[PDB]
Amino acid sequence: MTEYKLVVVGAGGVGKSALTIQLIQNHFVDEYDPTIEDSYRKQVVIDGETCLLDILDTAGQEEYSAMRDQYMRTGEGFLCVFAINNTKSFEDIHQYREQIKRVKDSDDVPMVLVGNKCDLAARTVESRQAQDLARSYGIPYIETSAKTRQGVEDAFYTLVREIRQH
Ligand SMILES: Nc1nc2c(ncn2[C@@H]2O[C@H](COP(=O)(O)OP(=O)(O)NP(=O)(O)O)[C@@H](O)[C@H]2O)c(=O)[nH]1
Ligand SMILES: [Ca+2]
Ligand SMILES: [Ca+2]
Ligand SMILES: [Mg+2]
Ligand SMILES: [Mg+2]
Numbered sequence: 001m002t003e004y005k006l007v008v009v010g011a012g013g014v015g016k017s018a019l020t021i022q023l024i025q026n027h028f029v030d031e032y033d034p035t036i037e038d039s040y041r042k043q044v045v046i047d048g049e050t051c052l053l054d055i056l057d058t059a060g061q062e063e064y065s066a067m068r069d070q071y072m073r074t075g076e077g078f079l080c081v082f083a084i085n086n087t088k089s090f091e092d093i094h095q096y097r098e099q100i101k102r103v104k105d106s107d108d109v110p111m112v113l114v115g116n117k118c119d120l121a122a123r124t125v126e127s128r129q130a131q132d133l134a135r136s137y138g139i140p141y142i143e144t145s146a147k148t149r150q151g152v153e154d155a156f157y158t159l160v161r162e163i164r165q166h
Contacts, residue, residue: 006053008057010093011089011092014058015117016079019155021146023152024153034061035055037064041145078111079111080111081114090130112140113130116143117122
């Protein structure tokens, strides 16, 4: 069947793991255990197509930045995650986009910009600001909460649909 290689990237603590685990395992991870690099695989039906999602859950802790080139090489689509209550994490997105862009040598890499933790009220990144960033990359912006499940399937499925447009 069709395999889609997704890679989840973004600053430490933005909820990359919580998002992936919510998608794959249907529960919310409340505790914070920084990730080195984990893999998840699951067969799902997306728009009538039975396919395999191979998802790489990457490290946001900057001390592991050396591992980025490797995973950006293999991945087919990238979920670029920031947290809506973390302005620095939003600012950090460009550095992830730029590296993906360099590694793929393409201004046309399947990506989705994700504003996570939308269940929290301490918002410092307004939807419109993120929409604008995404528009500049030519990609969708989707808000999510790994806690409530809001937008979680939408984000990952949209990334699959972006890979399909390429
Ligand atoms: N309220 C709320 N908390 C969230 C959400 N997503 C993640 N968190 C919380 O934020 C913390 C960090 O989540 P985690 O998924 O570990 O982040 P990460 O981006 O994978 N970190 P790392 O880059 O170090 O691997 C955890 O306490 C988790 O419960 C969300 O949507 N809402
Ligand atoms: Ca829990
Ligand atoms: Ca682009
Ligand atoms: Mg993690
Ligand atoms: Mg502001």
